[PDB]
Structures are given as structure tokens and as C-alpha cells.
């Protein structure tokens, strides 16, 4: 299994390299007209600042999602312990009524 894990890693790397070479082959045509050029950086200032703000918002969203997931977790374990207590109490109550 260790050997097969190594082999799978190697296969993945080989596949990635082959795909990169295929990408070069596909974009040879785009390289063909590499001499072309155009205007750039017209509204970059506001666009860059808004990109930075959006990156901050995305990071905050990732934090929020992580906190949401973990809280779902702890709520789950709390519910599970609550159900365990419920079952224990019900059984002991049944047994007291029997006695």
C-alpha cells in the first residue's frame, strides 16, 4: 500500500505534466500572434482597491464559514449528549415504575 501510494503520486504528477504540455500545444496558436499589444491600466486604481476590499470580504466569509461549520459541530455533540441523557432518564424512570 505504501508503494502504491507512491506510485499514485507519481502518476498524478505525470498526468499534470502531460496536461501542461497539452496546454502549451493548444496555446501555440495564441503564441503565434504574441506580437500584438493593447492599452492597459486605465481604471486600475479603483479596480485594484475594490479587488483588495473584495479579498478582505472573501477572507471574512471564509472565517465565517469555518465558524459556522464548527458551531454546527459543537451543537451536534450537545444534542447527542442531550439525547443520551434523555434515554438514560427514560430507562431509569421505566425501571423505577416497574419496581
Amino acid at each position: 500500500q505504501q508503494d502504491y501510494e507512491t506510485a499514485k503520486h507519481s502518476q498524478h504528477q505525470a498526468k499534470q505534466q502531460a496536461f501542461a504540455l497539452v496546454e502549451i500545444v493548444q496555446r501555440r496558436v495564441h503564441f503565434s500572434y504574441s506580437d500584438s499589444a493593447g492599452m492597459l491600466s486605465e481604471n486600475a486604481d479603483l479596480n485594484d482597491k475594490l479587488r483588495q476590499r473584495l479579498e478582505h470580504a472573501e477572507s471574512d466569509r471564509s472565517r465565517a464559514r469555518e465558524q459556522l461549520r464548527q458551531q454546527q459541530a459543537q451543537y451536534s455533540q450537545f444534542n447527542q449528549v442531550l439525547a443520551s441523557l434523555k434515554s438514560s432518564y427514560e430507562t431509569k424512570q421505566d425501571m423505577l415504575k416497574e419496581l
Binding site: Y4, L50, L54
Partner: protein, 148 residues
């Protein structure tokens, strides 16, 4: 009478535990709802920022003129250059590299399948070993594999 008294005390303690855990679960649920609202607010903000950036850049990126298109080819070529240990890698000679690396990839897949066959047979042999072990444990109880 004493036994029933003990069980009644047990039930009282269990009721106290149930109250405590119900309170904990209610607090956890309130926090969960709060975090749901907070998260949804964060995706709302992120989507709003994305849409506003799209609107602002609408005019900017429409007139691409197929002239800033080739830098993508440049980045792809360079990315292959570091990923593929071929500093001389040229879009001209990249086809020989493509075929050679494809040959290596298919060889790797064949070796992977060869390893997979033996891996599967070995794992299933261990599975039957384990099944024997569980049968022995259930019949007699704990014991080592050598004694099996």
C-alpha cells in the same frame, strides 16, 4: 423501599443533568443561528462586492482586442517550464516533450494498475485473516493471531 429511594434520587440527578444539557443545547442553537446569519451576511457582502467590481470593470475588459490574450500563453509556457524540468522547453519542441511525457504517464498508469492488483489481493487476504480473527474472538474471546 430503599432500592426505590435510590432510583428516585438517580432520577432527580438525571433530571438536573437534562436541564443543564437542555440549557447548553439552547445556547448552542442560538449561537448556531447567530453564526448562520453572520455567514449569510458575509456571502452577501462578498457577492455584492463581486457584482460591483464587475459593473465597474464592464467597460474596461470588454475591449480586450485579442492582444492581451497571448500573455496567458506566456504564463502557461512558463508554468510548464517550472513544472516540466525543461528550461529549453519551447513551443516548437514542446511536442516531443508532450509525447514523451504522455508515454511516461501511461507507463506510470500501467505500473499503478500492476501494484493495485497485488494491493487488492493482499488487502483481501488480510480481510479474510481478520474475519477469522473476529470469528475466533466471538467464539472464545480475546486471543492473539498466533493462537488463532
Amino acid at each position: 423501599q430503599e432500592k426505590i429511594d435510590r432510583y428516585q434520587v438517580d432520577l432527580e440527578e438525571l433530571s438536573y443533568r437534562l436541564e443543564e444539557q437542555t440549557d447548553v443545547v439552547e445556547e448552542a442553537g442560538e449561537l448556531q443561528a447567530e453564526y448562520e446569519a453572520r455567514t449569510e451576511a458575509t456571502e452577501q457582502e462578498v457577492d455584492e462586492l463581486k457584482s460591483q467590481l464587475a459593473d465597474y470593470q464592464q467597460a474596461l475588459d470588454v475591449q480586450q482586442t485579442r492582444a492581451i490574450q497571448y500573455q496567458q500563453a506566456l504564463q502557461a509556457l512558463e508554468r510548464a517550464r517550472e513544472l516540466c524540468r525543461l528550461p529549453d522547453l519551447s513551443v516548437d519542441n514542446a511536442e516531443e516533450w508532450l509525447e514523451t511525457f504522455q508515454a511516461k504517464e501511461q507507463q506510470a498508469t500501467e505500473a499503478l494498475l500492476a501494484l493495485e492488483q497485488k494491493l487488492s489481493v493482499a488487502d483481501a487476504a488480510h480481510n479474510q485473516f481478520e474475519q477469522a480473527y473476529q470469528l475466533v474472538k466471538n467464539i472464545v474471546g480475546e486471543t492473539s493471531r498466533s493462537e488463532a
